Design an enzyme around this catalytic site. Structure first.
Site, PDB file in Angstrom:
ATOM      1  N   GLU A 174      -4.204 -10.433  -0.317  1.00 31.16           N
ATOM      2  CA  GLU A 174      -5.173 -10.375   0.787  1.00 31.16           C
ATOM      3  C   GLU A 174      -6.562 -10.710   0.251  1.00 31.16           C
ATOM      4  OE1 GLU A 174      -4.788  -6.595   3.010  1.00 31.16           O
ATOM      5  OE2 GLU A 174      -2.627  -6.648   2.632  1.00 31.16           O
TER       6      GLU A 174
ATOM      7  N   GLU B 140       0.809  -1.225   0.000  1.00 38.20           N
ATOM      8  CA  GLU B 140       0.000   0.000   0.000  1.00 38.20           C
ATOM      9  C   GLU B 140       0.844   1.279   0.000  1.00 38.20           C
ATOM     10  OE1 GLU B 140      -2.689  -1.225   3.273  1.00 38.20           O
ATOM     11  OE2 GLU B 140      -4.294  -1.456   1.799  1.00 38.20           O
TER      12      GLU B 140
END
Ligand code: NA
Ligand code: NA
Ligand code: NA
Ligand code: NA
Lengths: 211, 211
Positions: free
Chosen positions: B145, B69
């Site tokens: 994820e 991220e």
């Protein structure tokens, strides 16, 4: 190949056409018995070459097809290459031998389902969504036949269209098919009725499968 | 990068490991503000290179990750290539900037759904089945994820696994996540209780999102 006027009408009214060579050897065992035999290459070549020579100037023709349900033989590869050499302006497709052979620019299965695999030996019909992303696969997928419209049918048609719209490389398909192949017969009173296989004393026959 | 003993245990008990650089700049606006800035390349480079130098002999490590991220910046591209150059034995992955950038060998989205597209601007999360077959795409897809296990959750888990098993190039994923990040506090009677964001006077906080 169709009656010559068909292509003129498709040119003018506006329909995309797949022009298909008059080669089908479905009843052979195995299906490619003739199409893999070099002795049948001359006869096959004329059916492909003379079609291209006749129809190559029609704008409605966008895709050439090597025929239908004749398995996959070396004669297909030869004629695939011949078309690519002589006319680079149009993709060549052919469904036989598993719908994704070296003889087709387009993955073009018949009756592959949207989500459900049909893992037949040698010639599986993968889910069309799955087929696209098989290891190394890059080609577009357009069903040469789907949604078999026999009698009370077209159940699940919406499932195909949802998939076509969601997946860029699922670029549609050709419904099987346009018009019932029924023939007119006349009863004792002269009243017409719709006849199918077997109604002319023809035997063996496949009954209502022509509709 | 984890405590060094972790890799030894994964080596010996047998778990595949994704070893990930300590780089996350999630709170930046836009997310790549630092990772596209050459003045931050040195700091980022040390976090990647010193990880590879430390962990490259562990058989359990099968994939390197550039962090998490932090958008997609030119620094990611540079460091992707550095790893590929020094250690050709392991693929490099990174999810930032849309999960399928030039800085990743594996399409590695977070929380992409099985059948449903989430077409966010710039960084869409495609259906994983659709993602595989986007025009020109050839890479394997493993979710970095998926299946967010917050509280009463994991509804629809079976849908992922059905897709994983059906599609060769869907090679699974990493559930988010293993263990609740709750902390023990003690009441006025000295009895322990599980605490989350905000229970320590911490503000602003994100409450139960740590579990
Ligand atoms: Na499409
Ligand atoms: Na029929
Ligand atoms: Na798989
Ligand atoms: Na969290």
């Amino acid at each position: 190949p169709n009656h010559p006027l068909w292509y003129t009408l498709c040119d003018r009214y506006g329909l995309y056409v797949v022009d298909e060579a008059n080669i089908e050897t479905h009843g052979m065992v195995p299906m490619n018995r003739l199409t893999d035999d070099p002795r049948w290459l001359p006869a096959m070549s004329e059916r492909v070459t003379r079609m291209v020579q006749r129809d190559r100037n029609h704008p409605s023709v966008i895709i050439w097809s090597l025929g239908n349900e004749s398995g996959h033989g070396a004669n297909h590869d030869a004629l695939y290459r011949w078309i690519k050499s002589v006319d680079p302006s149009r993709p060549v497709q052919y469904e036989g031998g598993g719908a994704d052979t070296t003889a087709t620019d387009i993955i073009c299965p018949m009756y592959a389902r949207v989500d459900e695999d049909q893992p037949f030996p040698a010639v599986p019909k993968w889910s069309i969504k799955k087929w696209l992303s098989l290891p190394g696969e890059t080609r577009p997928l357009i069903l040469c036949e789907y949604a078999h419209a026999m009698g009370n049918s077209l159940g699940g048609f919406a499932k195909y269209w949802q998939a076509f719209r969601q997946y860029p490389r699922l670029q549609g398909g050709f419904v099987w098919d346009w018009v019932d192949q029924s023939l007119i017969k006349y009863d004792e009173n002269g009243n017409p009725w719709s006849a199918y296989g077997g109604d002319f004393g023809d035997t063996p026959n496949d009954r209502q499968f022509c509709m």
